[PDB]
Structure formats: structure tokens, C-alpha cells
Write an enzyme that holds these catalytic residues in place. Structure first.
Site, PDB file in Angstrom:
ATOM      1  N   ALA A  81     -13.524  -5.165 -11.279  1.00 13.61           N
ATOM      2  CA  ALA A  81     -12.191  -4.678 -10.938  1.00 13.61           C
ATOM      3  C   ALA A  81     -12.234  -4.254  -9.485  1.00 13.61           C
ATOM      4  CB  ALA A  81     -11.776  -3.494 -11.812  1.00 13.61           C
TER       5      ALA A  81
ATOM      6  N   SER B 295     -17.443  -6.661  -8.988  1.00 16.46           N
ATOM      7  CA  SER B 295     -18.727  -6.446  -9.690  1.00 16.46           C
ATOM      8  C   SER B 295     -19.316  -7.694 -10.353  1.00 16.46           C
ATOM      9  CB  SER B 295     -18.670  -5.367 -10.755  1.00 16.46           C
ATOM     10  OG  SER B 295     -18.423  -4.013 -10.218  1.00 16.46           O
TER      11      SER B 295
ATOM     12  N   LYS C 266     -22.841  -8.823  -9.352  1.00 18.03           N
ATOM     13  CA  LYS C 266     -24.029  -8.135  -9.847  1.00 18.03           C
ATOM     14  C   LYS C 266     -24.953  -9.064 -10.599  1.00 18.03           C
ATOM     15  CE  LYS C 266     -21.838  -3.596  -9.362  1.00 18.03           C
ATOM     16  NZ  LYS C 266     -20.884  -2.594  -9.880  1.00 18.03           N
TER      17      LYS C 266
ATOM     18  N   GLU D 285     -21.454  -1.537  -1.786  1.00 16.81           N
ATOM     19  CA  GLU D 285     -20.533  -0.801  -2.641  1.00 16.81           C
ATOM     20  C   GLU D 285     -20.196   0.543  -2.018  1.00 16.81           C
ATOM     21  OE1 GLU D 285     -20.039  -3.218  -6.463  1.00 16.81           O
ATOM     22  OE2 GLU D 285     -18.865  -1.860  -5.169  1.00 16.81           O
TER      23      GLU D 285
ATOM     24  N   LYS E 127     -19.873 -10.647 -17.570  1.00 19.21           N
ATOM     25  CA  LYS E 127     -19.832  -9.672 -16.476  1.00 19.21           C
ATOM     26  C   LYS E 127     -18.425  -9.612 -15.885  1.00 19.21           C
ATOM     27  CE  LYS E 127     -21.163  -6.306 -13.834  1.00 19.21           C
ATOM     28  NZ  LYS E 127     -20.001  -5.528 -14.298  1.00 19.21           N
TER      29      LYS E 127
ATOM     30  N   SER F 227     -22.160  -1.858 -14.869  1.00 16.16           N
ATOM     31  CA  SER F 227     -21.463  -2.011 -13.611  1.00 16.16           C
ATOM     32  C   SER F 227     -21.744  -0.874 -12.591  1.00 16.16           C
ATOM     33  CB  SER F 227     -19.975  -2.269 -13.809  1.00 16.16           C
ATOM     34  OG  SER F 227     -19.547  -3.281 -12.921  1.00 16.16           O
TER      35      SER F 227
END
Ligand SMILES: *[B]([O])([O])[C]([C]C1=[C][C]=[C]C(C([O])=O)=C1[O])[N]C([C])=O
Length: 263
Positions: A212, A45, A48, A141, A209, A105
């Protein structure tokens, strides 16, 4: 500080996994400290931030609006969509989407934004254009968090990510107003509490930011500094550990504690 390198190595020992680390001077771009700076790690993540960066550049260029509303459906919903799942009926604006992807997230928020810019290949091309020939986004994702060993897809290098973030936050790439917007989102981060934030002393500035993934992947990117202002970029990635989420959080926070302590 070499003492921080000691903690990093200690972390690798504790987690039984590789740790990638980098400390970068915000102003000069000088590498202050490094540990496996040029090895690849899955971004998770953390990407992002880069995504919203690309979105902001589009906005600056008149090709997009913060106010534009996006209407998605239940079919778009992916695991880890705390925010998006609440606005199914009315949709959300580009602004709210970036906010959700960064501060929470939100996975769906990311896929939606990815779509607006032309997908991973486009994000990738954006990076390449700004001088980052290493970082690459290949999937959507949530497959991008797969972290299969030795896989180059969806990875970065600690030095690459650090320098790229620096350019984003202080380069001529984004208009000053967009830069700030970016920082504002990172600053409002809501899921990184147990990482760097837990070692941060009062009055300090933090824009970060986290991320995981599978295979014990965990990471964080951040701009921090004393006196309400950032002066350094810190990037920390790990992967391969069989340790729990909590143990991974602890090691990261302990690395943070060391870096602050030796500021
Ligand atoms: B991200 O790492 O690509 C993605 C979404 C995510 C979910 C929960 C917590 C975090 C974090 O600590 O920032 C996240 O990034 N990860 C997955 C597994 O979907």
C-alpha cells in the site's frame, strides 16, 4: 478470461484509477490475460519479495548467512515496524528479518536488509542481471511509497514483475532450497487477508505479497493454484484512487473472485 477483464475495467470505474493486471502461466511463462501490462506502477512493499530474493542469492553464494544476527537501534526504527520494534535489545537474524519483511511487511526489516546488500542500487542491479530491465528500486522506506504521478522511481510494470517473480520461483537463479524458503515466506503472509486470500477456495495454494502507499496505491503479487500447488502468477497494481483502503481491498478481492471463478 475476458470476463475478468470486465471486472478489472469495472474496478477502474469504481476506484476512478488505473489498474494494472496480469495473469501468467507458471510453467510456460505464457501471458494468459493482461490489462495495462506495460504501464509503470509503484511497487510499494511488493518489492520485499525481490529484496529477500537478492538476500537468498547471497546466502547461496556463501556471502551471507541466514543465521547472522543484525543489531540495530531505535534510530533505525521507521513507521510500520511491528516486528523490529520488539527486538531492539537482542537484534534479529537475516532469516527473521526476511520473515518479518515478507509475512508482516516490516519497513525497518527492509531497510536493514537493504543495507546488507548495498542499497537500492544493488537491488536494482540484481534485477537487471536477471533480465529485468524495467523494475527499479530508488529509495528506502518509507519514502519509496510516495507514488507521485508520472514518477519512475520505485516502479515496475505488471509484465516485468510477473516474469521476474516467475524466474525467482522456478528459475536456476536460486538453489532449490532457497526457492522453497522464498515460497515459504510468501505463503505465511499475514497482512493480505482481505485481498486475494478472501476469494480463495479451500485446498488452494497461495504465496503472496501485498503493498500500500500514498495516492491510493495498493497492490499484490501472488503465485496460486488449485490442489495445494501453484500454477499461475497474478499481479495487480493500482494507483491514483481517492478511495478508502477498504474499497480498494474489495475491488482487488472482486478481481480475484472473477479470476478464480473463470479458472
Ligand atoms: B509497503 O507497502 O512498502 C509499506 C509497508 C506496509 C505497511 C502496512 C500494510 C502493507 C501491505 O498491505 O502489505 C505494507 O506494505 N507501506 C507503507 C505505506 O509504509
Amino acid at each position: 478470461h475476458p470476463e475478468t477483464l470486465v471486472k478489472v475495467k469495472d474496478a477502474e470505474d469504481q476506484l476512478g484509477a488505473r489498474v494494472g493486471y496480469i495473469e501468467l502461466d507458471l510453467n510456460s511463462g505464457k501471458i494468459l490475460e493482461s490489462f495495462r501490462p506495460e504501464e509503470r506502477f509503484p511497487m510499494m512493499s511488493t518489492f520485499k519479495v525481490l529484496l529477500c530474493g537478492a538476500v537468498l542469492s547471497r546466502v547461496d553464494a556463501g556471502q551471507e548467512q541466514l543465521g547472522r544476527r543484525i543489531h540495530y537501534s531505535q534510530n533505525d526504527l521507521v513507521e510500520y515496524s511491528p516486528v523490529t520494534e520488539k527486538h531492539l535489545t537482542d537484534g534479529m537474524t537475516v532469516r527473521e528479518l526476511c520473515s518479518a519483511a515478507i509475512t508482516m511487511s516490516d519497513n525497518t526489516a527492509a531497510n536493514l536488509l537493504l543495507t546488507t546488500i548495498g542499497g537500492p542500487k544493488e537491488l536494482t542491479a540484481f534485477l537487471h542481471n536477471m533480465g529485468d530491465h524495467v523494475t527499479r528500486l530508488d529509495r528506502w522506506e518509507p519514502e519509496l511509497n510516495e507514488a507521485i504521478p508520472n514518477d519512475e522511481r520505485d516502479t515496475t510494470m505488471p509484465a516485468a514483475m510477473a516474469t521476474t517473480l516467475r524466474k525467482l520461483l522456478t528459475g536456476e537463479l536460486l538453489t532449490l532450497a532457497s526457492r522453497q524458503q522464498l515460497i515459504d515466506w510468501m505463503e505465511a503472509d499475514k497482512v493480505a487477508g482481505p485481498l486475494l486470500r478472501s476469494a480463495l477456495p479451500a485446498g488452494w495454494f497461495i504465496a503472496d505479497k501485498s503493498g500500500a502507499g500514498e495516492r491510493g496505491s495498493r497492490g499484490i503479487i501472488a503465485a496460486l493454484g488449485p490442489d495445494g500447488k501453484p500454477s499461475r502468477i497474478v499481479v495487480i497494481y493500482t494507483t491514483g484512487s481517492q478511495a478508502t483502503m477498504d474499497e480498494r481491498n474489495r475491488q482487488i478481492a472482486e478481481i480475484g473472485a472473477s479470476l478464480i471463478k473463470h479458472w
